[PDB]
Structure formats: C-alpha cells, structure tokens
Amino acid sequence: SQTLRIGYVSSLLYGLLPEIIYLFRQQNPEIHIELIECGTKDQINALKQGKIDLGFGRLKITDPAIRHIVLHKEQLKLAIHKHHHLNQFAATGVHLSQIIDEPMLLYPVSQKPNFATFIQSLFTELGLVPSKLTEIREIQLALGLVAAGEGVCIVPASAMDIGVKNLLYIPILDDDAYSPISLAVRNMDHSNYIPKILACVQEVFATHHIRPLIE
Amino acid sequence: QTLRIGYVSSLLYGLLPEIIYLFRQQNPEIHIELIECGTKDQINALKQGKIDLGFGRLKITDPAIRHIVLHKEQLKLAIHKHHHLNQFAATGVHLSQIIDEPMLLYPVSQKPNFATFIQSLFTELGLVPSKLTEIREIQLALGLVAAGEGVCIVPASAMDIGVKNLLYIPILDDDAYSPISLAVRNMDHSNYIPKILACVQEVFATHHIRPL
Numbered sequence: 001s002q003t004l005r006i007g008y009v010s011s012l013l014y015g016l017l018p019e020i021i022y023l024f025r026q027q028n029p030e031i032h033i034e035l036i037e038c039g040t041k042d043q044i045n046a047l048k049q050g051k052i053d054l055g056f057g058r059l060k061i062t063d064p065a066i067r068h069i070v071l072h073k074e075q076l077k078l079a080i081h082k083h084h085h086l087n088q089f090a091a092t093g094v095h096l097s098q099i100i101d102e103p104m105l106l107y108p109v110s111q112k113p114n115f116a117t118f119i120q121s122l123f124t125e126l127g128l129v130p131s132k133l134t135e136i137r138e139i140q141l142a143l144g145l146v147a148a149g150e151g152v153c154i155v156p157a158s159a160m161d162i163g164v165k166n167l168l169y170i171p172i173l174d175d176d177a178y179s180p181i182s183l184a185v186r187n188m189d190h191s192n193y194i195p196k197i198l199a200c201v202q203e204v205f206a207t208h209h210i211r212p213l214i215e
Numbered sequence: 216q217t218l219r220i221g222y223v224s225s226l227l228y229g230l231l232p233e234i235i236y237l238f239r240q241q242n243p244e245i246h247i248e249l250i251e252c253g254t255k256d257q258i259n260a261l262k263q264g265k266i267d268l269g270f271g272r273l274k275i276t277d278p279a280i281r282h283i284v285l286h287k288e289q290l291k292l293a294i295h296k297h298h299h300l301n302q303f304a305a306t307g308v309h310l311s312q313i314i315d316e317p318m319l320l321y322p323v324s325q326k327p328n329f330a331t332f333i334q335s336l337f338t339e340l341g342l343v344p345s346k347l348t349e350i351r352e353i354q355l356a357l358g359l360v361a362a363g364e365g366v367c368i369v370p371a372s373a374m375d376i377g378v379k380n381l382l383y384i385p386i387l388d389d390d391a392y393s394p395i396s397l398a399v400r401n402m403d404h405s406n407y408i409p410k411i412l413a414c415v416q417e418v419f420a421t422h423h424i425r426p427l
C-alpha cells in the first residue's frame with residue numbers, strides 16, 4: 001500500500017489528466033492517491049521536500065534534483081467576451097503584437113516563475129511590452145472576469161472547455177505561442193510508480209490519437 | 216462609486232458574469248471589484264463594508280444581513296460515466312440510496328459552508344453517510360470524481376464545468392436544492408441593490424425564455 005501524492009495545476013483538470021489517474025488507479029488498485037493544487041514552482045519545492053512524488057505542470061524549471069519530462073505542447077488561445085471587437089479574428093487568429101494595448105488578465109498569483117511570468121517571457125521574446133496587465137488568483141476567475149467584461153486573457157487550448165459562458169477563444173498565430181504540459185519528478189526517485197504513470201499518460205494519449213512517444 | 220461584490224467560485228460557471236456584464240453596461244459610471252469569498256466570510260465582509268453585495272449558496276441568518284433568495288437550484292450527483300449509478304441517469308436517485316457511496320464534500324473553508332449544507336440534508340432525513348471526504352474546492356471535487364475516487368453532490372450549473380467523462384444523476388428528494396441568495400447589509404438602501412436585482416431579472420428572464 002503506497003499513497004502516491006500528485007501535484008497539479010488546476011487547468012489540467014479539464015484535460016486528460018483525470019482519465020490518466022483513473023486509468024492508473026484501475027491498473028494499480030493497491031496504490032492510493034491524493035491530488036493537491038500547486039504552481040509549477042511550488043512543485044519543485046514540494047518534490048524536493050518529498051511533499052509530492054509527481055508534479056504535473058506548465059513550466060520547465062531547470063534544477064539538479066528535478067527530472068522534467070515534456071508530455072505535450074499545447075497551443076495558446078486568447079479568451080475574449082463574445083461581443084469584444086476581436087470577434088472578427090475568431091476565424092483567422094491574432095498575433096500578440098496586435099493586442100499589446102488591450103486590458104489583459106494574467107494568472108495565477110503565486111511564487112515566480114508562474115504561468116504569468118511564462119506569458120510575460122513570451123512578450124519579451126516577441127519584442128512586445130503590454131501596457132495594461134492585471135494579475136488574478138486562478139484560471140476560472142480570470143475567465144469569469146473576461147465574461148464579466150474586464151479584459152482579455154491568454155489561456156491554453158484546453159481552457160476552451162471550462163464552462164464559463166459567453167466566451168470566444170481566438171487562435172494565437174505566433175510561432176512561440178505554446179504552453180508545454182510536463183511531468184516533474186525527483187531525479188533520484190527510481191520508484192516504479194514513475195514509469196507506470198508515464199505508461200498511463202501514453203495509453204490515454206494514444207487512445208486520443210495524440211501519440212508521439214514521450215522522451 | 217466603487218461597488219465591491221463577493222461571490223463563490225461555482226457561480227462563475229452560471230449566469231452571474233452575464234449579470235455583472237449587464238450591470239456594467241447599463242451603469243458605466245460604476246466601477247466594480249469582484250472578490251472570491253465564502254458565504255460565511257461574506258457576512259463579516261458586509262458588516263465591515265468590505266463588500267457591498269454577497270452572492271452565495273447558503274442562508275446564514277444574522278441581524279445585520281438580509282438574504283434575498285434569487286433561485287432555488289436542483290442538486291445533481293456527479294459520478295464517473297462507468298459508475299454503477301449510471302443506471303439512474305433517466306430516473307434519478309434518492310439521498311437515502313447513496314449514503315454508503317464514497318462521497319466528496321466541498322469546499323474546505325470556515326463553516327457553515329456547502330459541505331455542512333450537504334451534510335445537513337442527510338441529517339434532516341435521518342441519514343448518516345458512512346464515507347465523507349472534504350475537498351478544497353469544486354474543480355478538484357469533480358476532477359477526483361472523474362479520477363474515480365467517489366461521487367459528489369453538486370448544483371445543476373456544475374454540469375457545464377467541463378471535467379471530462381462525467382454524468383450528473385438527478386437527486387429526487389424534495390429538500391435536494393441549493394438556494395442562490397444575494398446577501399446585503401440589512402438596512403442598506405443604496406440604489407445599486409434594486410439595480411443589481413433588475414440585472415438578475417433581465418438575465419434570468421432572457422434565459423427562462425431564450426434561446427431557441
């Protein structure tokens with residue numbers, strides 16, 4: 001009997017992660033499981049300290065003690081209210097240099113590096129300096145607020161299915177406009193539950209026909 | 216004016232944002248701040264003037280606070296799509312029949328909260344659940360359900376929270392509803408109160424009627 005403790009960023013609950021856990025549970029019934037919400041940075045510390053054994057996240061934080069496997073690179077979308085003047089680019093899509101002056105929401109509020117600093121790093125890379133930014137606690141608030149008419153917000157593709165009403169998700173046409181889904185584990189951790197969970201990720205992935213091999 | 220509004224996270228998946236968006240269009244001169252805040256914590260925030268309106272799912276009585284029930288919303292049992300209760304997707308189930316199901320409550324917050332509300336529904340019917348687990352908040356509860364860790368009673372609007380591979384079984388008991396109430400300072404007669412209720416109506420009536 002092993003209690004495997006898994007860290008996750010919230011937006012992954014709307015993708016394939018729950019299936020992967022479900023699959024893992026059915027295949028490994030003796031291994032009990034706990035899920036904890038925490039940012040990618042906090043997972044490094046959680047992992048290092050042994051608070052969690054696996055970390056599913058959105059950022060590659062390089063570190064001696066941490067082995068980091070990129071699972072899938074997911075396109076980014078700009079979330080808007082359905083009446084916002086960027087409607088017209090629903091089909092074609094937008095470059096980030098076209099919305100530098102738009103009131104924008106970043107998320108989450110957390111110890112850096114965040115998904116917030118990930119986006120700001122994308123702006124820097126693309127020579128862009130956003131004039132109107134606001135930080136919001138977590139993703140569902142951000143989207144709620146976009147629906148409430150408080151600006152636009154860059155999110156990953158799988159945020160589309162979240163359930164907040166009256167939104168549109170404009171494609172982002174930039175080359176670097178992708179958010180990597182990754183699994184962080186302890187470099188020294190040689191437990192069998194690591195390759196097992198990786199087997200599940202691949203099994204689910206293959207069923208959904210998104211199957212380049214990981215690693 | 217700077218109007219400050221308290222809300223619970225699940226409401227963001229329903230009509231509330233439309234209500235805010237509408238109010239914001241009709242009253243452009245009024246600035247708005249939205250703050251996450253449990254229904255219990257709303258009582259104290261109102262008293263302090265920390266917030267002006269509270270949007271919650273419980274009717275916590277208090278001399279200082281007026282509860283305006285906006286909508287009584289049906290509760291549903293969230294289950295994994297292969298869970299043995301999927302037989303009852305059409306017919307629905309009773310709370311007396313799920314007392315022994317591994318159950319997830321939420322959130323983890325100062326009580327009374329939605330967790331104590333759900334617990335009181337069983338207590339009210341003389342039922343005592345054999346396996347309960349408190350979970351931080353709704354998204355995780357449903358994620359866990361899809362992960363195969365149990366069942367979770369949730370309001371109807373939770374159906375649209377797009378956690379994959381779930382079914383939402385009707386709950387047949389008469390008491391099995393969650394009231395969505397507006398909490399305000401008792402004697403507060405600001406004109407944003409009637410205005411916000413007007414916006415609630417307009418959004419409600421648009422959806423009670425439309426779309427085709």
Ligand SMILES: O=C(O)/C=C\C=C/C(=O)O
Binds near residue numbers: 113
């Ligand atoms: O995906 C989300 O919903 C939130 C945060 C993601 C990464 C981070 O904070 O490092």
Ligand SMILES: O=C(O)/C=C\C=C/C(=O)O
Binds near residue numbers: 324
């Ligand atoms: O609605 C939710 O998502 C959670 C809690 C609601 C009310 C409360 O805790 O008082």
